[PDB]
Structure 1
């Protein structure tokens, strides 16, 4: 029944919000639709895998909030294996390489690739993290898709194909599905192209020992019976003195404030009284989540290491079910595994297959790319198709189709009377990630503390000290990378 704040959703964002409010002495209730916490994180345990992250997994430098929260809850990280060579598989052939970026040898192609990434970061510098619609060319960039931008910028097919893979991997969506403004914001707010795409010194550097699901689980442990599982919220009524929140299983909660910690579009599953303001009413129909199947194939040994491959594969082309992999072997060297993503349209295309059929396709692909018959001998397989989840809508996160961010972006985290908005989609740094979930949950909690007159306005948004365990190395460029001409630039010199 009665409390200070009802938090809708027990993912990392809702849990982080509820923990902050609880720690500040307020009575909080978390209403969670599923029979588990964690949301877009989910750690499965069984004897064959020990544990495996089937949802969000990776953390890395500059993600100081999730690192701090997890540390406080008693979690540790380990490094994703990147000791040996990465592979870029293109036109049916594997090209091993060292460093974060696949080498390009044709000189014109080199200029084209160099210019593309440079231009993405250059454009990002004009986009405010907290207000992408305030970019000088916001409308121009929002009114084109990433496909149109790539078509404009890439003078080579090589660059266009790799840029396409990059978009598909970062946002689990096709280049033609997403706004260029939104995508450029998305990369910039993760620290740029190098930071978002890198394992060492980037977003994929580390995983949590025992799984990321432990973040939400351990906060649920702290909160005890304040977390109500299998309580999908169906109705929020703000017409009276206290806010009334009703669940599907016919319970009523009464609170001073509510935090909505669910993906924006999942606000549609709640009937509002009074109705939402027009802009939010339409916004929540305009913001889908991406499409992905996360697939983990287990082997007797991390056999790829013997061939001086780390397990990272960047696989171009329509035929390959999986465009990107990482080594998912445990820090101890056992439960050898390759994690791969079936991205965007391929998640839709291949969802029809059986689990065994997807396993066979992945093993055959890996055998080709790793040049090893050992890939054909899996000992176990786990997968999760996030497209099927009623209470997620997809993964990793919400994307904005052309025209939406400039028209509706302003209302994403605008309070609606006594409802405040958390969820990783409302973050300004690593929005889309567990890091963003923490930022947004804690910010939304502090908005309520401010509304209650408990903290001053300047304490709503709080900086985070850098992790001592996961220090960030700066991203650097060389003189040549900065100054080499684009393809049209070299043509203009002729």
Structure 2
């Protein structure tokens, strides 16, 4: 029944909020809809895989909050395999390469590719992380889809196709589904294009030994009986002195404050008294999550390594069920595996098939790309379709369709009386990730601490010291990369020299 703060949702954000508040000496309850904690992270354990992350998994440099929280809980990271060559598969052909990005040899295509990435970052610099709607051209960029932006920016099909794959992979949505402003914000608040797509020195550098699900599990252990599983919140009443929170299984909870640590649209599952203010009421119907099936194919050995392939494949084209893979072999070199995401429309399309049919398509693709018959002999397969999750709504995170961020973005983390808003979607650095969940959870917790008069206002937003275990190399550009012209820039140079 009675406590200081009810936290709705036991994912990383809710658990981090509850832990902070508990550590501060407050009585907290976590109400979790599912029979488990973790939310969009889920570590499956069986004999065949030992352990596997079926949701959120990767961490990297600049993600200092999740790294610190996990370290405190007794967890370790290991490096995702990127020792050998990456593969770029284009027009039914594989091109091995070293370094983070597939080389471009055609000089026009090179200028186009260079300009695209550069422009994405240039545009991002105009977008405040904590207030994207305050960008000078916010409205213009928000009233455009990423598809429209790509059509304007890319003078080659090659750049457009790779840019499209980049969008699909980053936000599990089609270029035509998402606001250009929102997507540009999303990339910028992750530290830019290089940081977001890189394995080495980027978001995909590392995984947790034993799985990411341990983060939420170990906090639950610390909180004891304070975490209530199978308690979906259905009703929040703020008419009285204490907030009343009701669950589906008929239980009633009373608190001074509430943290909502669920995906914004999942707020729809709760009936509010009094009704939510107009802007939030409408906002929560406007913010869908993306579509993804995470698939892991297991092999007897990491055979790709013997061919000097690290396991990273970037695969162009509609036919490919998966567009980006990573080696998912354990740090010990066993339980050899390839991880791939079936993204956006392909998640929708391929969900109609059986598990076995999906496995077959993946193996035949990998056999083609790696040029290896061994890819046709999987020993095991695991997958998770996040689109079917009632209490997630999708994965990895919430996307904003055109026009929504400028009109409703201000509302995202605006408190509603005694309800404060956590969840990775309300973060300002690595929003969408486990890192963002920690930031948002701890910030929401601190908002309540300030409301109670326990901390000053300037302590609500707290900086994080850099991890000593996972140091961040700065993102650099060469002179040529900075100053080489775009395609229209080169054409203008030709038109001017013709005088």
Give the deviation of 1:258 after TM superposition. Answer: 0.2
Q: CA deviation at 1:313?
A: 0.4
CA distance in 2, matches of 1:162, 1:98: 18
Query: How far did 1:426 drift?
Result: 0.1
* Alignment-derived partner of residue 397 in structure 1: 397
Match of 1:439 in 2: 439
The C-alpha deviation readout for 1:329-350, integer Å capped at 9, x for no partner, is 0000000000000000000000
Indicate the SS of the match to 2:70: helix
In 2, Cα distance between equivalents of 1:341 and 1:306? 24
Deviation at 1:199, TM superposition (A): 0.2
Report the counterpart of residue 139 of structure 1 in structure 2.
139
Cα offsets for 1:37-93 (capped at 9, x unmatched):
000000000000000000000000000000000000000000000000000001100
Shift of 1:360: 0.2
**What is the TM-score normalised by the length of structure 2?**
0.99
- Deviations, residues 276-314 of structure 1 (Å, cap 9, x unaligned): 000000000000000000000000000000000000000
Equivalent position of 1:291 in the other structure: 291
TM-score calculated relative to the size of structure 1:
1.00
Count, aligned residues: 494
Cα-to-partner distance string for 1:2-43 (whole Å, 9 max, x where unaligned):
000000000000000000000000000000000000000000
Unaligned runs of 5+ in 2: 495-499
2:50 is the alignment partner of 1:65 = no
Question: How far apart are residue 263 of structure 1 and its match?
Answer: 0.1
CA distance in 1 between partners of 2:314 and 2:248 (Å): 44
Q: Using the alignment, how far apart are the partners of 1:183 and 1:95 within structure 2?
A: 29
Task: State the distance in 1 between where 2:37 and 2:215 align.
Answer: 9
d(CA) in 1 for partners of 2:155, 2:386 = 35
Kindly report structure 1 stretches of 4+ aligned residues shifted beyond 6 Å.
none
Q: Deviations over 1:138-190 (max 9, x none)?
A: 00000000000000000000000000000000000000000000000000000
CA shift for structure 1 position 432: 0.1
Supply the distance in 2 between the matched residues of 1:88 and 1:256 (Cα, whole angstroms). 55
Give secondary structure in 1 for the equivalent of 2:339.
strand
Output the CA distance in 1 between the equivalents of 2:324 and 2:193: 16
SS in 2 for 1:7: strand
1:421 and 1:17 mapped to 2: Cα distance? 10
Structure-2 residue corresponding to 1:34? 34
**Cα RMSD (Å):** 0.2
Question: What secondary structure is seen at the aligned counterpart in 2 of 1:46?
Answer: coil
In 1, the alpha carbon distance for the partners of 2:278 and 2:165 equals 36
The aligned counterpart of 1:426 is 426
SS at match of 2:342: strand
Q: CA deviation at 1:262?
A: 0.1
Query: What secondary structure does 2:67 align onto?
Result: helix
Match of 1:9 in 2: 9
Aligned match of 2:176: 176
Measure, in 2, the Cα distance between the counterparts of 1:88 and 1:415. 46
Residues of 2 paired with 1:436 and 1:269: CA distance?
23
SS at match of 1:158: helix
- CA shift for structure 1 position 460: 0.1
Taking the aligned partners of 1:96 and 1:485, their CA distance within structure 2 comes to 27
Query: 1:458 Cα shift?
Result: 0.2
Cα deviation, residue 374, structure 1: 0.2
What does residue 309 of structure 2 align with?
309
CA positional deviation for 1:210: 0.0
- 1:383 aligns to what SS in structure 2? strand
